[PDB]
Symmetry: C2
Subunit: 161 residues, 2 copies
């Protein structure tokens, strides 16, 4: 009637200088034995919740310095946005790009990005200009119609060269 | 006739778009832009949506973590790049003291913190690692807990 749970309770947890204590194997690094101070607040208290938990996934944050304009050039030049397209401080997720899309006699590269309850279109037109179109789902508009709206105006710009 | 006039007529008049701008293929910055407003709030800047000065932003990656490995990595490499993870809680790696002399025996002991608490890790010979938690809400602190951890560590070190 003496285990590890008893020994750490007597020589380490009894001082009430620790919240709990465990023993981890130098091999794998996982705790085989542990105690904690609980059961006074809640009888249904698992003290393994503190020392053990199976392999799960977590997010790691890095900081990168963004040039908003470059996020647009990289989309047409390279064909991706690893961090999304940034415009006016808002993050849009790069979804689709359709290269050499033919609309009424003219070719267009057109990209589509999404935000929460909205999104944007980017349309490369010749003469060296890019058309930017925003849409907002809260205003009963959508990407399909806004893309059509973008394409209709684009042809007009496309006529001037 | 300006740009804001031309896009208001050919694009926002369609009320299928929320706003529109055009970016030069050179720098990629919008020189001209329009948006739809004047109904809720008259005093709004329509550039807030299209332009913004070079700033810094956060990028998220996903990692699959094994908590045991996060304890080993502290001793093997000497810091914890992702913090030390135990029982689902992230502790921020602060200090590691190698070959600390406590009453005749040497110890490698690391200290980690979370909000209002923390933990100590002590490698003792014979191949065990001692893990000690402390909670500031229970009037405990890192120093006293390290001493308690260190003194108990001494006992296991004797049994080897």
């Amino acid at each position: 009637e003496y285990s590890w749970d008893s020994y750490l309770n007597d020589r380490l947890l009894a001082t009430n200088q620790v919240s709990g204590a465990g023993l981890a194997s130098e091999e794998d690094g996982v705790v085989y034995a542990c105690v904690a101070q609980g059961e006074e607040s809640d009888p249904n208290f698992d003290k393994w919740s503190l020392f053990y938990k199976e392999d799960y996934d977590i997010e790691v944050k890095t900081t990168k310095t963004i040039n908003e304009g470059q996020t647009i050039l990289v989309v047409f030049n390279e064909g991706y946005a690893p961090d999304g397209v940034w415009l006016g401080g808002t993050k849009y997720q790069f979804i689709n790009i359709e290269r050499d899309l033919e609309f009424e006699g003219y070719n267009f590269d057109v990209a589509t990005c999404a935000k929460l309850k909205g999104g944007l279109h980017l349309v490369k037109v010749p003469g060296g200009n890019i058309l930017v179109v925003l849409y907002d789902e809260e205003k009963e508009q959508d990407r399909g119609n806004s893309k059509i709206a973008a394409l209709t105006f684009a042809k007009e710009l496309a006529e001037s060269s």
